[PDB]
Structures are given as structure tokens and as C-alpha cells.
């Protein structure tokens, strides 16, 4: 009986693949061929952030381009000003191995987690002045891969157990648990409309989930290795994702097919972080080959090489105002480029 | 240069001094990893040599040297994605129960997968064959490994197999048990020889 259901599901998947292949009438290379190129964006090191003591793992930008949060493998969540290099706060975490960190749009709460299976959300506007533990979201069964602030009270959080959960800062319970995947979740990305989001897994899979409905509407499996980086397009109808095979791909939730592929034979080092600009023209990807290579979202050409680092690039983040890009690697250096 | 900006700069300098003081203790301690299957004897090691929560940390001081060992007890058996978080650590300690011949093949398989990892190409791994007394009482193996029928001790089969599967960073095969008391000193000597070799390869003195 199970064989019939399995072959029927396989036939449905084949029909979906044929439908996605037949609707493609013209590729993006032929459409973006008569457009003007971007040239070479040679960025330089504007600020130098050497405040951390161990390897930096992740970072995230907020609404204001001044503050910037960063996490390291020691357990010191450092929030500092990107303008005058001033360190605003240094939160001593209960653990050391951190894998992700976020910054709320209102700047009132910050998140951090990792292999601890517990998300520690702290407060910044505390009347006591010091940083006190505000919420301890517990209940996961896997290492925390990526987490972001959807709202000042509710936020989605992924884990290493192939499942994601929508937690509340005030309640602290799973109000919506998404369907488990076939591979460990590695990264996620919220949409600007705050209605849906996307999340990548380890078994070359990407799922688009909704906030209200816990069912995935878009599924992408056009990869050949484990996905380690994924970012959402600011327009709200596309998103780029990167794997360990040094092949980045831009998918669209409207067409449900590949739009652009960024890869070269000279680079065989996978990427760990991807992010678009304020408009979406340039795509900055954090390569592990002691440097980074930016690409064009339309022409899929190398628009510049940033070789200001000397270790594996851990994370890369573009601010909301599009004025600076913070790249953190394992050399305890979170360098700012413009 | 306003007064508020100068006060912020002073606060940043104080935070930097605090981070330096923390980095002092961070570099004074040695961060170790602990790995092993479900049938491994890591529980006896962390219970006796002590001198949901997906990761457990054991901080112990011996011979005026502090060691912080991180072990996984409530995580998945896959060691592909989260294994990169433990890069550039001092050393890894793998535990294996030599008395269980059935799960010995899977133990060797996972040990080979961990040793041949791309992110662990310069991290030393120390193998601990627990349940030595149980293995001695049991032997007093050919169906699982026929090479034991042809292998002879040099003028040691498990150690030879571990060396062959490792050399196929240097491994340190040792033998431990549930009643051993000098295991802490052995781990100390191993983690000291590893640091000495690292200093020799950094100073170009190898």
C-alpha cells in the first residue's frame, strides 16, 4: 500500500518539475544582456572593529546603521557603534559557542544561541542599565542555526533538529511549530513584508513558510550540496541561497525556478553568508577562500573582490540604510566596507 | 569632541580592558572536545575524572592548568554541520567501548569520518578504549575482524587497527577503564605534548 502512495508522490513531483520547466520561456541571461554593467566596486576598509577576543561567528544589522551586534565563540555579545567605534554594551553569555545573533528593529531586545538549545533574549532599555536575562526560550532538540526578530514580541527560531518554531517573548512557548525537514536547518531569512520567510536545510532544500499558516508554500531543491547561506531579496518576490559547492542561486517565489547562478571554476570554496544591498543590485557573498567576491544580481558577473581578511569568512551583513557592510571572520576582525 | 562622546570613549576603553582581562583567562584555559557514541563510556569519564542542555561543559583545574571540556549529550549523531564550531580547539577526546565487538565497526566508521573531516585536519584526537577490565574478562573477535587470526603482537590489535585507520594531527591511542584514577594525569601529559608540538610547528622548530 505504501508503494502506491510513494509512486504517486513521485509522479506528482515529476509533474511539478515538468510544469516548472515548461513555463520557462526565456532565461534571465537573454533578458539582462542588453543592460549596462556595473563595472568594479572596489570597496575599502572604512572602520576596523577588533574588539572581540575570539573567532567571530555571526552578526546582524538593525534599523539604525549606528549600532551593530556581533557574537564570538567566547560568549561576549558585543553591541558597538559603527560610526565612532564606540562599544555600547558587552553582554557576557552563559556559554561560549555561539552560532547566531539578531537585533530587534526597535533596538529593545537581542537574541543569541547555538549548541545550548536555549535562546537567551536580553534587554537593552532596562531601567537598571545593565543587561539582564529577559527570556530563556527552551524546548528545542537541536543546535540553534539562525534566528531573527520578526516583531518586538514574537520571533521565529530554527534549530538543528530540522524544525523551526515561532516563540513569543512574553509567553515563551511554541505557538507555531513548522513541519520538519530532511536535513539540518542552517539559515533563514525574513521578508520585508513581515508576512512570510524562507529557510534552508542541509539536504539541498529551501522552504518558504508563513507566519500565520504553518504550512510551506514554496519548495526548492535545485542544489547539489548542503546549503550554508540564504538571503531574501528586498523586493519581496525573490531570494538568493548559497551552498558549500561555491554555487549561489537566486530563486523567485512567483516563478518557482532558477533565475541566476553565480559560480566559477577558479573558486571551489563554498560561501557562508550572503546579503543583498538596499536596492538589490549587488550580491555580497562570504567566501571561505580568505576573501569575498561580489556578484551582479542580473548579469551574474564578478563585480569585485574584497581581500581584506586572512581567515575563513564567517558572516557578512548589509545595513538597512545601505551605507556599510560588516564582514566578520575567524580572525576576530569585523571589518566595515563602503 | 563633546563630553558625552569622551565619556563613551572612556566606557569603550573600560570595556576593552575587561575584554582583555577575560581573554587572559580564556587563553590560560585549554578548550577540549569530547566525542563518542551512545555505548561509549564518556559518562564514567566525566563522572570519575571530574578534577534541554545539548552541550555540557566541565571546567576542572589540575597541575595549575585549567581544562574546559565540551561534550554533546542531547544532540543529533550527525557531525557534519556543527563540527566546524569546534575548530582550532586544543584537542578532541574520542571514547570507544572495546568490549562491544558488534558496535566496534560503527565506532571505527565514525572515528574515520571524524578524523578525515576537512575542518579537523589540524586537530589532534586522543582515543580512549574504555571497559578494559570487561574486555579482559571477555577475551579470557575473529568473526567480526578476521585479521586478528593473522595479526601478531610486535616483538594490541585494537590499537593497531586504530593506528591504521588514523594514518590512512597525530592520534594518541590509550587504554582506560571505570576504576582508573591516573587518567587525568595521562590526559594532562597528552594535552601538554600536543601544545609542545603546536609550539614547535609554529616556531618552525619541528
Amino acid at each position, epitope marked *: 500500500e505504501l508503494d502506491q502512495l510513494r509512486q504517486e508522490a513521485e509522479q506528482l513531483k515529476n509533474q511539478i518539475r515538468d510544469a516548472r520547466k515548461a513555463c520557462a520561456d526565456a532565461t534571465l541571461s537573454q533578458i539582462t544582456n542588453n543592460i549596462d554593467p556595473v563595472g568594479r566596486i572596489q570597496m575599502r576598509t572604512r572602520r576596523t572593529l577588533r574588539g572581540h577576543l575570539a573567532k567571530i561567528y555571526a552578526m546582524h544589522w538593525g534599523t539604525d546603521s549606528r549600532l551593530l551586534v556581533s557574537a564570538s565563540q567566547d560568549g561576549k555579545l558585543i553591541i558597538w557603534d559603527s560610526y565612532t567605534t564606540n562599544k555600547v554594551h558587552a553582554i557576557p553569555l552563559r556559554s561560549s559557542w555561539v552560532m547566531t545573533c539578531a537585533y530587534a528593529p526597535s533596538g529593545n531586545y537581542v537574541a543569541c544561541g547555538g549548541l545550548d538549545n536555549i535562546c537567551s533574549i536580553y534587554n537593552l532599555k532596562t531601567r537598571e542599565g545593565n543587561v539582564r536575562v529577559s527570556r530563556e526560550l527552551a524546548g528545542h532538540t537541536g543546535y540553534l542555526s539562525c534566528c531573527r526578530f520578526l516583531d518586538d514580541n514574537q520571533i521565529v527560531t530554527s534549530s538543528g533538529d530540522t524544525t523551526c518554531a515561532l516563540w513569543d517573548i512574553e509567553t515563551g512557548q511554541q505557538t507555531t511549530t513548522f513541519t520538519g525537514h530532511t536535513g539540518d536547518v542552517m539559515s533563514l531569512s525574513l521578508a520585508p513584508d513581515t508576512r512570510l520567510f524562507v529557510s534552508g536545510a542541509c539536504d539541498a532544500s529551501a522552504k518558504l513558510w508563513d507566519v500565520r499558516e504553518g504550512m510551506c508554500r514554496q519548495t526548492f531543491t535545485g542544489h547539489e550540496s548542503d546549503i550554508n547561506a540564504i538571503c531574501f531579496f528586498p523586493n519581496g518576490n525573490a531570494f538568493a541561497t548559497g551552498s558549500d559547492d561555491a554555487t549561489c542561486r537566486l530563486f523567485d517565489l512567483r516563478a518557482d525556478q532558477e533565475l541566476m547562478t553565480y559560480s566559477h571554476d577558479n573558486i571551489i570554496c563554498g560561501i557562508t553568508s550572503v546579503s543583498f544591498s538596499k536596492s538589490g543590485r549587488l550580491l555580497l557573498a562570504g567566501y571561505d577562500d580568505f576573501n569575498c567576491n561580489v556578484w551582479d544580481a542580473l548579469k551574474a558577473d564578478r563585480a569585485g573582490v574584497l581581500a581584506g581578511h586572512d581567515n575563513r569568512v564567517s558572516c557578512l551583513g548589509v545595513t538597512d540604510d545601505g551605507m556599510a557592510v560588516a564582514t566578520g571572520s575567524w580572525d576576530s576582525f569585523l571589518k566595515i566596507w563602503n | 569632541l563633546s563630553a558625552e562622546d569622551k565619556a563613551a570613549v572612556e566606557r569603550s576603553k*573600560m570595556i576593552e580592558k575587561q575584554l582583555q582581562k577575560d581573554k587572559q583567562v580564556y587563553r590560560r584555559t585549554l578548550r577540549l572536545l569530547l566525542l563518542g557514541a551512545d555505548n561509549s563510556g564518556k559518562s564514567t569519564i566525566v563522572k570519575q575524572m571530574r578534577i534541554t542542555s545539548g552541550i555540557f561543559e566541565t571546567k576542572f583545574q589540575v597541575d595549575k592548568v585549567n581544562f574546559h571540556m565540551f561534550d554533546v549529550g542531547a544532540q543529533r549523531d550527525e557531525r557534519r554541520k556543527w563540527i566546524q564550531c569546534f575548530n582550532d580547539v586544543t584537542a578532541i577526546i574520542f571514547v570507544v567501548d572495546s568490549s562491544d565487538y558488534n558496535r566496534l565497526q560503527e565506532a571505527l566508521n565514525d572515528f574515520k569520518s571524524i578524523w578525515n573531516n576537512r575542518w579537523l585536519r589540524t586537530i589532534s584526537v586522543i582515543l580512549f578504549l574504555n571497559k578494559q577490565d570487561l574486555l579482559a574478562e571477555k577475551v579470557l573477535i575473529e568473526d567480526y575482524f578476521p585479521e586478528f587470526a593473522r595479526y601478531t603482537t610486535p616483538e594490541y590489535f585494537i590499537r593497531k587497527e586504530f593506528v591504521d585507520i588514523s594514518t590512512a594531527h597525530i592520534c594518541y591511542p590509550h587504554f582506560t577503564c571505570s576504576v582508573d584514577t591516573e587518567n587525568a594525569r595521562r590526559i594532562f601529559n597528552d594535552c601538554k605534548d600536543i601544545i609542545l608540538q603546536m609550539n614547535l610547528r609554529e616556531y618552525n622548530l619541528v
Partner: single-chain antibody
Amino acid sequence: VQLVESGGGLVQPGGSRKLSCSASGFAFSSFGMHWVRQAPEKGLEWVAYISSGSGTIYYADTVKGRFTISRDDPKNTLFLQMTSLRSEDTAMYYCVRSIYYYGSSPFDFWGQGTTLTVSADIVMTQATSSVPVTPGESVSISCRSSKSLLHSNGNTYLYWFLQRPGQSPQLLIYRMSNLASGVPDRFSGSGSGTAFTLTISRLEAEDVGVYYCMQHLEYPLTFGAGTKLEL
């Protein structure tokens, strides 16, 4: 949260005292403590300023040499010693916590203090002192300064306060464009680098009082005369 001050009383001219402000409810080592003198029927007067870690300490040029401020982190207590008490040192002392960072809340809470009886400079002269208006309408107080306190960074250094009879002053605005916490949204600040305007649309019987002000551009802090509502 709880700042208990002690060391007050009637002292002969030329003596010495040790004002002690025990703090409880916040990180005393992180906040920078300050002192403010309020003479009878007079405004505030800055005396000392110490940051976190006791790195640099600033004293008022009018009382420099006689005052000595010192904090203790193990006990988390502030002490202030003074010698050669003159006829002008007799005033009510207020010891005040403040933290400095991007978008901070300096001079957030003011201690209860204790009375004590004995026996370029920013001259922020207000445009109008007494504006007697019954509660229930919308008003706007206007003030000016002798020097433009608008630095090149773009943050207007201006601290609006409000001291009702009986209770310590309370902070209203951070930098003339960001309201404080625990305060109603009726108060708003605007103006240019020279002139400042504090407008409130709904007046109540509780928010009435004297609206003080100060500058934070240079190191020597000079508390202005404030909105002294006479009659």
C-alpha cells in the same frame, strides 16, 4: 532606583562634611554619578562629574579645589567631601546616576537628597520665565543659549527636567528629539542649535512645575536658570 543620601544638617562656616549616597537597584559601577546644588528659590548648580571606572573626574570652576568625589564599587557607594564652607555652599544636594552611550539616558533618576545649612561658559538665559497658564490647554516654553550647543555630530545636547514641589527633578527629553521613558508623549522638543522650544498639548494638575534645562556640549556643565514660574 533607590538612592539614599545622608550627611546633611546645620554646619558652621568653615567646617567639613562627608555626603554619602548609597545606591541600590542598578549597576553603580556602570553609571556616572553627578552632583547638583539647589539653593532656596534658585536653580541647579553642577559641581562634580565622574565617569565609569574613575578614569577622569571634572570639577566646577566655581568650587574647584574644595570638593572631592569618590565612588566605591565593592560597597557601591558615592562619597563627597568638602572643606572651607562659604556662605554660598548652603544648598540642597542631589546625587544623580547617568550612563553615556549612543542614545543613552543621562540624568535619568534624581535622588531624594538632603538639606544642608551653613551659618566658553554656557549662560542659557531663558526667553520667558513666568508663564502662568491654567491646566487643560496647550503651551510652549521657549529658551535660548549664548553659544550654539549643536556639535558637528548632529545631536542637540539639551536635557529638559521638571522638579515638582516635594519630589526630585525628572528627566523629560534626551537630546531635544527623543523622549524619555515613563513620561507622557505630550511633551515635545524642537528648535534650532540656538533656540529651543518645549511644547505640551495637554496640561494636567500633576505635570505642573518648574522646567529646568542644561547644556552638555563642553566639559564644564552649567545648569541654566530654567522656566522659573514666579507669582
